[PDB]
Design a protein around this nucleic acid. Structure first.
Ligand SMILES: [Mg+2]
Ligand SMILES: [Mg+2]
Length: 41
RNA sequence: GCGGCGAGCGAAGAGGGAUCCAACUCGUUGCCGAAUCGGUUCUUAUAGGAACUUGAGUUGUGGCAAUGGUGCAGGAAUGGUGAAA
Protein backbone atom coordinates (compact mmCIF):
# COMPACT_ATOMS: atom_id res chain seq x y z
CA UNK A 1 0.00 0.00 0.00
CA UNK A 2 2.90 2.32 0.79
CA UNK A 3 4.75 1.70 -2.41
CA UNK A 4 1.57 2.57 -4.22
CA UNK A 5 1.21 5.90 -2.45
CA UNK A 6 4.80 7.14 -2.77
CA UNK A 7 4.55 6.47 -6.46
CA UNK A 8 1.56 8.79 -6.37
CA UNK A 9 3.48 11.50 -4.61
CA UNK A 10 6.19 11.11 -7.18
CA UNK A 11 3.52 11.76 -9.81
CA UNK A 12 2.94 15.23 -8.39
CA UNK A 13 6.39 16.73 -7.79
CA UNK A 14 6.86 20.25 -6.58
CA UNK A 15 8.30 22.34 -9.37
CA UNK A 16 12.09 22.63 -9.38
CA UNK A 17 13.82 25.95 -8.79
CA UNK A 18 14.85 25.98 -12.44
CA UNK A 19 11.25 25.77 -13.57
CA UNK A 20 9.53 27.79 -10.86
CA UNK A 21 11.48 30.83 -11.98
CA UNK A 22 10.60 29.97 -15.55
CA UNK A 23 6.90 29.71 -14.72
CA UNK A 24 6.87 33.10 -13.03
CA UNK A 25 7.70 35.22 -16.06
CA UNK A 26 3.95 35.27 -16.52
CA UNK A 27 1.30 26.45 -10.48
CA UNK A 28 1.33 22.78 -11.56
CA UNK A 29 -0.52 20.51 -9.17
CA UNK A 30 1.82 19.02 -6.56
CA UNK A 31 1.82 17.39 -3.16
CA UNK A 32 1.83 19.75 -0.21
CA UNK A 33 5.03 19.21 1.71
CA UNK A 34 6.31 20.72 4.88
CA UNK A 35 4.99 20.53 8.39
CA UNK A 36 3.62 24.05 8.26
CA UNK A 37 1.90 23.78 4.93
CA UNK A 38 0.69 20.28 5.61
CA UNK A 39 -0.67 21.38 8.94
CA UNK A 40 -2.91 23.92 7.22
CA UNK A 41 -4.14 21.54 4.62
C1' G B 1 10.26 50.67 56.23
C1' C B 2 14.13 46.84 58.26
C1' G B 3 16.42 45.85 62.97
C1' G B 4 19.17 41.48 69.44
C1' C B 5 13.20 47.33 66.78
C1' G B 6 19.65 47.58 69.56
C1' A B 7 24.24 49.42 67.07
C1' G B 8 22.38 50.44 63.10
C1' C B 9 20.33 50.02 57.93
C1' G B 10 16.95 52.39 54.50
C1' A B 11 14.43 53.00 49.58
C1' A B 12 10.30 54.07 45.72
C1' G B 13 6.22 56.78 43.08
C1' A B 14 5.56 61.61 42.11
C1' G B 15 8.18 66.62 41.07
C1' G B 16 12.35 70.02 38.53
C1' G B 17 16.02 68.61 35.04
C1' A B 18 19.83 66.08 31.61
C1' U B 19 18.96 62.98 27.28
C1' C B 20 15.52 62.35 23.84
C1' C B 21 13.20 64.59 15.30
C1' A B 22 14.19 56.66 20.08
C1' A B 23 12.66 53.41 19.03
C1' C B 24 12.63 48.34 16.79
C1' U B 25 13.18 42.80 15.71
C1' C B 26 11.78 37.72 16.20
C1' G B 27 8.70 33.53 17.68
C1' U B 28 3.53 33.03 17.24
C1' U B 29 -1.15 34.15 14.55
C1' G B 30 -3.09 34.81 9.52
C1' C B 31 -2.07 34.99 4.09
C1' C B 32 1.65 32.83 0.98
C1' G B 33 5.56 28.72 0.72
C1' A B 34 12.29 28.69 -1.10
C1' A B 35 10.31 33.95 -3.02
C1' U B 36 15.56 32.14 1.27
C1' C B 37 20.40 31.27 2.22
C1' G B 38 25.60 29.42 0.61
C1' G B 39 28.71 28.90 -3.31
C1' U B 40 30.06 29.83 -8.70
C1' U B 41 30.07 33.45 -12.78
C1' C B 42 28.90 38.11 -14.05
C1' U B 43 28.72 42.87 -14.88
C1' U B 44 34.91 48.20 -13.46
C1' A B 45 30.89 44.90 -7.43
C1' U B 46 32.59 38.05 -1.75
C1' A B 47 25.87 44.87 -4.87
C1' G B 48 20.18 43.99 -0.83
C1' G B 49 21.87 43.32 -9.03
C1' A B 50 21.89 38.97 -12.61
C1' A B 51 22.56 33.97 -14.42
C1' C B 52 23.72 29.50 -12.30
C1' U B 53 24.01 25.71 -8.77
C1' U B 54 21.22 20.06 -4.27
C1' G B 55 24.95 22.60 -1.95
C1' A B 56 22.03 24.09 3.17
C1' G B 57 16.78 24.54 3.82
C1' U B 58 10.48 22.99 4.03
C1' U B 59 12.02 18.98 11.16
C1' G B 60 10.94 26.19 7.70
C1' U B 61 14.61 30.29 4.98
C1' G B 62 11.90 34.44 3.62
C1' G B 63 8.08 38.09 2.29
C1' C B 64 3.15 40.60 3.83
C1' A B 65 -0.52 42.16 8.12
C1' A B 66 -1.51 42.30 12.61
C1' U B 67 21.94 49.04 -2.58
C1' G B 68 26.28 48.44 -4.67
C1' G B 69 30.17 50.58 -8.73
C1' U B 70 32.01 54.59 -10.33
C1' G B 71 32.97 60.27 -10.56
C1' C B 72 33.66 65.25 -9.27
C1' A B 73 33.85 68.42 -5.90
C1' G B 74 33.43 71.79 -1.24
C1' G B 75 33.43 71.73 4.01
C1' A B 76 34.82 70.47 8.80
C1' A B 77 39.11 68.85 11.00
C1' U B 78 43.68 68.42 11.63
C1' G B 79 48.33 70.02 10.26
C1' G B 80 51.82 73.96 6.96
C1' U B 81 52.48 79.13 6.61
C1' G B 82 52.00 83.82 8.56
C1' A B 83 51.74 90.51 11.42
C1' A B 84 53.55 95.61 15.29
C1' A B 85 56.96 98.09 17.89
MG1 LIG C 1 22.75 47.31 53.79
MG1 LIG D 1 10.43 32.69 9.92
Amino acid sequence: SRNELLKLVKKYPSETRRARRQRLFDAPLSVVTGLQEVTRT
